[PDB]
Amino acid sequence: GSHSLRYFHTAMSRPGLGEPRFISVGYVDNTQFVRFDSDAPNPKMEPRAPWVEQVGPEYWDEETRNAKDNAQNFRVNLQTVLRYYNQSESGSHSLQRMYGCDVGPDGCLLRGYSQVSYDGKDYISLNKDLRSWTAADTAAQITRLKWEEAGVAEQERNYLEGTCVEWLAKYLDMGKETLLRAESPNTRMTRHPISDREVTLRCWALGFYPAEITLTWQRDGQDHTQDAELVETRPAGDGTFQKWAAVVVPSGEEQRYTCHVQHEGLPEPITLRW
Protein backbone atom coordinates (compact mmCIF):
# COMPACT_ATOMS: atom_id res chain seq x y z
CA GLY A 1 0.00 0.00 0.00
CA SER A 2 1.51 3.27 1.26
CA HIS A 3 4.16 3.43 3.95
CA SER A 4 6.18 5.75 6.14
CA LEU A 5 9.41 5.75 8.12
CA ARG A 6 9.48 8.28 11.00
CA TYR A 7 11.64 9.20 14.01
CA PHE A 8 10.40 10.87 17.19
CA HIS A 9 12.75 12.68 19.60
CA THR A 10 11.89 14.12 23.01
CA ALA A 11 14.03 16.29 25.30
CA MET A 12 12.84 17.04 28.87
CA SER A 13 14.50 19.33 31.40
CA ARG A 14 14.61 17.98 34.98
CA PRO A 15 15.71 21.05 36.94
CA GLY A 16 18.43 20.32 39.51
CA LEU A 17 18.59 16.66 38.43
CA GLY A 18 21.61 16.54 36.16
CA GLU A 19 21.10 16.11 32.46
CA PRO A 20 17.86 16.39 30.52
CA ARG A 21 16.34 13.16 29.30
CA PHE A 22 16.49 12.50 25.54
CA ILE A 23 14.25 9.62 24.35
CA SER A 24 14.28 8.57 20.70
CA VAL A 25 12.07 6.06 18.86
CA GLY A 26 11.73 4.80 15.31
CA TYR A 27 8.60 3.67 13.50
CA VAL A 28 7.89 1.95 10.27
CA ASP A 29 4.18 2.67 9.88
CA ASN A 30 2.51 1.67 13.18
CA THR A 31 5.18 -0.68 14.51
CA GLN A 32 7.96 0.65 16.73
CA PHE A 33 11.33 -0.79 15.91
CA VAL A 34 14.03 1.30 17.68
CA ARG A 35 14.55 3.22 20.96
CA PHE A 36 17.17 5.26 22.84
CA ASP A 37 16.98 6.54 26.45
CA SER A 38 19.63 8.88 27.87
CA ASP A 39 18.82 7.39 31.32
CA ALA A 40 20.49 4.11 30.40
CA PRO A 41 23.87 2.73 31.51
CA ASN A 42 26.28 2.51 28.59
CA PRO A 43 23.19 3.45 26.56
CA LYS A 44 22.81 2.17 23.01
CA MET A 45 19.92 2.19 20.56
CA GLU A 46 18.20 -1.16 20.99
CA PRO A 47 16.01 -2.95 18.45
CA ARG A 48 12.31 -3.14 19.29
CA ALA A 49 10.87 -5.25 16.43
CA PRO A 50 12.39 -8.66 15.63
CA TRP A 51 12.85 -8.19 11.86
CA VAL A 52 15.48 -5.45 12.34
CA GLU A 53 18.10 -7.28 14.42
CA GLN A 54 20.02 -8.95 11.57
CA VAL A 55 21.53 -5.63 10.54
CA GLY A 56 25.29 -5.43 10.94
CA PRO A 57 26.87 -4.26 14.22
CA GLU A 58 28.20 -1.29 12.21
CA TYR A 59 24.64 0.12 11.98
CA TRP A 60 24.00 -0.01 15.72
CA ASP A 61 27.25 1.70 16.62
CA GLU A 62 26.73 4.32 13.90
CA GLU A 63 23.24 4.98 15.31
CA THR A 64 23.97 5.26 19.05
CA ARG A 65 26.81 7.48 17.86
CA ASN A 66 24.17 9.67 16.19
CA ALA A 67 21.70 9.28 19.07
CA LYS A 68 24.33 10.43 21.55
CA ASP A 69 25.06 13.61 19.59
CA ASN A 70 21.34 14.35 19.31
CA ALA A 71 20.96 14.14 23.10
CA GLN A 72 23.96 16.43 23.53
CA ASN A 73 22.84 18.86 20.81
CA PHE A 74 19.33 19.01 22.27
CA ARG A 75 20.34 19.70 25.87
CA VAL A 76 22.04 22.84 24.59
CA ASN A 77 18.95 23.65 22.49
CA LEU A 78 16.83 23.55 25.67
CA GLN A 79 19.21 26.16 27.05
CA THR A 80 19.21 28.31 23.90
CA VAL A 81 15.41 28.40 23.77
CA LEU A 82 14.91 29.05 27.47
CA ARG A 83 16.81 32.33 27.03
CA TYR A 84 15.11 33.30 23.75
CA TYR A 85 12.10 33.36 26.09
CA ASN A 86 13.75 34.31 29.42
CA GLN A 87 12.13 31.54 31.39
CA SER A 88 13.56 30.42 34.71
CA GLU A 89 16.14 27.64 34.73
CA SER A 90 13.98 25.98 37.40
CA GLY A 91 11.11 25.36 34.99
CA SER A 92 10.64 21.98 33.35
CA HIS A 93 10.40 22.38 29.58
CA SER A 94 10.17 19.93 26.67
CA LEU A 95 11.53 20.10 23.12
CA GLN A 96 10.12 17.65 20.56
CA ARG A 97 11.30 16.85 17.05
CA MET A 98 9.84 14.66 14.32
CA TYR A 99 10.94 13.75 10.80
CA GLY A 100 10.30 11.15 8.14
CA CYS A 101 9.03 10.29 4.70
CA ASP A 102 5.94 8.79 3.06
CA VAL A 103 6.45 6.64 -0.04
CA GLY A 104 3.70 5.63 -2.44
CA PRO A 105 2.61 2.21 -3.70
CA ASP A 106 5.43 2.10 -6.25
CA GLY A 107 7.74 4.00 -3.89
CA CYS A 108 6.68 7.35 -5.41
CA LEU A 109 7.87 9.35 -2.32
CA LEU A 110 4.82 11.41 -1.37
CA ARG A 111 5.87 13.75 1.45
CA GLY A 112 8.89 14.54 3.55
CA TYR A 113 8.27 16.25 6.87
CA SER A 114 10.47 17.67 9.64
CA GLN A 115 8.91 19.56 12.55
CA VAL A 116 9.87 20.90 15.95
CA SER A 117 7.72 21.92 18.91
CA TYR A 118 8.69 23.55 22.18
CA ASP A 119 6.55 22.63 25.17
CA GLY A 120 3.92 21.12 22.87
CA LYS A 121 3.43 24.26 20.79
CA ASP A 122 4.61 24.44 17.18
CA TYR A 123 8.02 26.08 17.04
CA ILE A 124 9.46 25.80 13.52
CA SER A 125 8.71 23.40 10.72
CA LEU A 126 10.04 22.53 7.32
CA ASN A 127 7.56 23.45 4.61
CA LYS A 128 6.07 21.13 2.01
CA ASP A 129 8.63 22.32 -0.57
CA LEU A 130 11.53 20.98 1.64
CA ARG A 131 13.23 24.35 1.07
CA SER A 132 11.57 26.93 3.38
CA TRP A 133 10.70 27.19 7.08
CA THR A 134 7.52 28.22 8.86
CA ALA A 135 8.56 29.88 12.13
CA ALA A 136 5.89 30.38 14.76
CA ASP A 137 7.10 33.27 16.90
CA THR A 138 9.92 35.79 17.11
CA ALA A 139 12.18 33.31 18.96
CA ALA A 140 11.83 30.63 16.26
CA GLN A 141 12.72 33.23 13.63
CA ILE A 142 16.20 33.41 15.07
CA THR A 143 16.49 29.64 14.65
CA ARG A 144 15.09 30.09 11.12
CA LEU A 145 17.81 32.65 10.43
CA LYS A 146 20.59 30.33 11.68
CA TRP A 147 19.21 27.44 9.65
CA GLU A 148 18.86 29.48 6.49
CA GLU A 149 22.48 30.69 6.60
CA ALA A 150 23.73 27.17 7.04
CA GLY A 151 21.91 25.39 4.30
CA VAL A 152 19.96 23.24 6.76
CA ALA A 153 16.90 22.59 4.55
CA GLU A 154 19.18 21.12 1.88
CA GLN A 155 20.77 18.62 4.24
CA GLU A 156 17.27 17.62 5.39
CA ARG A 157 15.77 17.50 1.88
CA ASN A 158 18.44 15.10 0.68
CA TYR A 159 18.03 13.01 3.82
CA LEU A 160 14.25 12.79 3.30
CA GLU A 161 14.45 12.21 -0.48
CA GLY A 162 17.26 9.65 -0.47
CA THR A 163 18.36 8.12 2.81
CA CYS A 164 14.80 8.03 4.15
CA VAL A 165 12.99 6.45 1.23
CA GLU A 166 15.87 4.07 0.61
CA TRP A 167 16.17 2.78 4.16
CA LEU A 168 12.39 2.61 4.43
CA ALA A 169 12.39 0.28 1.40
CA LYS A 170 15.07 -1.80 3.12
CA TYR A 171 13.01 -2.04 6.33
CA LEU A 172 9.84 -3.39 4.70
CA ASP A 173 11.73 -6.16 2.89
CA MET A 174 13.25 -7.27 6.19
CA GLY A 175 9.83 -7.25 7.84
CA LYS A 176 7.97 -8.52 4.79
CA GLU A 177 5.99 -11.12 6.77
CA THR A 178 5.24 -8.67 9.62
CA LEU A 179 4.55 -5.29 8.09
CA LEU A 180 3.10 -6.14 4.70
CA ARG A 181 0.47 -8.52 6.18
CA ALA A 182 -2.70 -6.84 7.44
CA GLU A 183 -4.67 -8.45 10.28
CA SER A 184 -8.47 -8.53 10.15
CA PRO A 185 -10.14 -7.58 13.46
CA ASN A 186 -12.03 -10.12 15.50
CA THR A 187 -15.57 -8.83 15.47
CA ARG A 188 -18.20 -9.58 18.12
CA MET A 189 -20.97 -7.64 19.83
CA THR A 190 -21.88 -8.06 23.50
CA ARG A 191 -24.91 -6.85 25.48
CA HIS A 192 -24.70 -5.25 28.92
CA PRO A 193 -27.84 -4.66 31.04
CA ILE A 194 -28.46 -1.21 32.48
CA SER A 195 -32.06 -1.52 33.66
CA ASP A 196 -35.52 -2.85 32.86
CA ARG A 197 -35.71 -0.14 30.23
CA GLU A 198 -32.47 -0.17 28.26
CA VAL A 199 -29.15 -1.89 27.74
CA THR A 200 -25.65 -1.04 26.52
CA LEU A 201 -24.82 -2.88 23.28
CA ARG A 202 -21.08 -3.08 22.61
CA CYS A 203 -19.41 -3.66 19.27
CA TRP A 204 -15.90 -5.06 19.63
CA ALA A 205 -13.12 -5.36 17.05
CA LEU A 206 -9.92 -6.94 18.39
CA GLY A 207 -6.49 -7.90 17.15
CA PHE A 208 -6.38 -5.94 13.92
CA TYR A 209 -3.48 -4.36 12.04
CA PRO A 210 -2.79 -1.76 10.97
CA ALA A 211 -4.31 0.64 13.46
CA GLU A 212 -6.74 2.33 11.10
CA ILE A 213 -10.31 1.11 11.17
CA THR A 214 -13.89 2.33 11.09
CA LEU A 215 -16.81 1.17 13.20
CA THR A 216 -20.35 2.25 12.38
CA TRP A 217 -23.71 1.73 14.08
CA GLN A 218 -26.98 1.60 12.10
CA ARG A 219 -30.42 1.67 13.79
CA ASP A 220 -33.20 0.22 11.58
CA GLY A 221 -30.88 1.01 8.65
CA GLN A 222 -30.30 4.57 9.93
CA ASP A 223 -26.83 5.74 10.63
CA HIS A 224 -26.95 6.25 14.43
CA THR A 225 -23.24 6.82 15.03
CA GLN A 226 -24.34 10.22 16.47
CA ASP A 227 -25.21 8.81 19.93
CA ALA A 228 -22.61 6.02 19.97
CA GLU A 229 -19.60 6.10 22.28
CA LEU A 230 -16.43 5.07 20.47
CA VAL A 231 -13.27 4.78 22.54
CA GLU A 232 -10.08 5.65 20.66
CA THR A 233 -8.12 2.75 19.15
CA ARG A 234 -5.76 1.30 21.71
CA PRO A 235 -2.79 -1.03 21.40
CA ALA A 236 -3.36 -4.68 22.24
CA GLY A 237 0.17 -5.39 23.47
CA ASP A 238 0.93 -8.08 20.82
CA GLY A 239 1.43 -5.28 18.36
CA THR A 240 -2.18 -5.35 17.19
CA PHE A 241 -4.91 -2.89 18.05
CA GLN A 242 -8.44 -2.71 19.45
CA LYS A 243 -11.38 -0.31 19.54
CA TRP A 244 -15.10 -0.64 20.36
CA ALA A 245 -18.33 1.33 19.93
CA ALA A 246 -21.36 1.12 22.24
CA VAL A 247 -25.02 2.17 22.01
CA VAL A 248 -27.89 2.38 24.49
CA VAL A 249 -31.25 1.06 23.39
CA PRO A 250 -34.87 0.38 24.46
CA SER A 251 -35.38 -3.22 25.50
CA GLY A 252 -36.64 -5.51 22.76
CA GLU A 253 -35.23 -3.11 20.19
CA GLU A 254 -31.80 -4.80 20.10
CA GLN A 255 -32.85 -6.62 16.93
CA ARG A 256 -33.35 -3.18 15.42
CA TYR A 257 -29.59 -2.65 15.01
CA THR A 258 -26.42 -3.36 13.06
CA CYS A 259 -22.73 -2.78 13.61
CA HIS A 260 -20.38 -2.44 10.68
CA VAL A 261 -16.62 -2.85 10.78
CA GLN A 262 -14.60 -1.73 7.76
CA HIS A 263 -10.89 -2.58 7.79
CA GLU A 264 -8.06 -2.99 5.30
CA GLY A 265 -7.78 -6.75 5.84
CA LEU A 266 -11.52 -7.46 5.69
CA PRO A 267 -12.09 -8.89 2.19
CA GLU A 268 -15.45 -7.27 2.21
CA PRO A 269 -16.79 -5.15 5.11
CA ILE A 270 -18.55 -7.24 7.83
CA THR A 271 -21.90 -6.35 9.41
CA LEU A 272 -23.37 -8.09 12.45
CA ARG A 273 -26.64 -8.23 14.42
CA TRP A 274 -27.51 -9.52 17.88
Binding site: Y7, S24, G26, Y59, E63, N66, A67, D69, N70, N73, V76, N77, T80, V81, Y99, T143, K146, V152, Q155, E156, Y159, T163, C164, W167
Partner: peptide
Amino acid sequence: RSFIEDLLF
Protein backbone atom coordinates in the same frame (compact mmCIF):
# COMPACT_ATOMS: atom_id res chain seq x y z
CA ARG B 1 18.42 4.80 9.77
CA SER B 2 18.69 8.14 11.60
CA PHE B 3 19.30 11.60 10.18
CA ILE B 4 22.82 12.80 11.02
CA GLU B 5 22.15 16.44 11.95
CA ASP B 6 24.43 18.96 13.62
CA LEU B 7 21.19 20.72 14.37
CA LEU B 8 21.32 23.54 16.89
CA PHE B 9 18.73 26.24 17.62
